[PDB]
Amino acid sequence: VKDQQEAEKKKVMSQEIQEQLHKQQEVIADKQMSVKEDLDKVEPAVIEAQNAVKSIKKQHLVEVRSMANPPAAVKLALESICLLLGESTTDWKQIRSIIMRENFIPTIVNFSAEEISDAIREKMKKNYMSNPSYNYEIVNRASLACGPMVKWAIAQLNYADMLKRVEPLRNELQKLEDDAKDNQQKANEVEQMI
């Protein structure tokens, strides 16, 4: 009778612990659903960036390849994507060689800034946050040859700010979803033990 009273006290404590773990799991599941909405926003923003990538004309790329003395606005617009791939050269005679090469088109197709280094991106942020060319009005006025590709560059830098935010949010979600599932399994195991 004393051993059964001690086991009954241990069972009531484990019952209260199992209730607290079930409430903690429900709070974790609510936090997981809130970061899931953030993850859905980031996935549509990535999809919009991919749609901007698809919005490329083959003719518009070679207008840049056939341009020998361009407006200074479109010259800076290609300097935006020059160092994105990692070319520090700024002369137009020398930078038209990367534009001229055929490696230039498929690299724009599969491109991701998730793999792009933070340090080079920081250089892409510092230089291009001062640009009149970054303003979608200067490029459009200068040419519609640089309109869509510059629109893709703008999308990508906005995507990188959204991404500092996204790596934090997704890290939170992986932790929140994993903690919610582990808390639910633990809640089931403790309810079975109770």
In angstroms, the CA 73 to CA 139 distance is 6
Assigned token pair, 47: 């999809």
The four Cα atoms 72, 74, 77, 83 give a dihedral, to 10 degrees, of: -70
Residue 24 CA, chain-centre distance (Å), reads: 30
Assigned token pair, 45: 């923003």
122-140 burial, b at 16+ Cβ within 10 Å, e below that, comes to eebeeebeebebbeeebbe
- Report the length, in residues, of the chain: 194
Name which of 139, 165, 141, 164 is nearest 76 in CA terms: 139
In angstroms, the CA 113 to CA 164 distance is 11
Assigned token pair, 11: 């069972």
Cα dihedral sign for 96, 100, 105, 111?
negative
Resolution of this entry in Å? 11.0
Q: Computed over its alpha carbons, how large is the radius of gyration of the chain?
A: 27
- CA angle 158/74/61 to nearest 5° reads 85
In angstroms, the CA 170 to CA 168 distance is 6
Query: Taking the CB of residue 153, how many other CB atoms lie within 10 A of it?
Result: 23
What separation in angstroms does the CA of 136 have from each of 26, 142, 148? Answer: 46, 10, 10
In angstroms, the CA 23 to CA 99 distance is 59
Assigned token pair, 149: 């590709």
Solved by what technique?
cryo-EM
Dihedral-angle region of residue 86 (phi above 0 means left; psi in -120 to 50 means alpha; beta otherwise):
left
Residue indicated by tokens 């920081």: 122
What separation in angstroms does the CA of 63 have from each of 23, 66, 74, 125? Answer: 62, 5, 11, 27
In angstroms, the CA 188 to CA 18 distance is 8
Assigned token pair, 184: 């639910």
In angstroms, the CA 157 to CA 86 distance is 15
| 72 contacts 146 by C-beta, under 8 angstroms | no
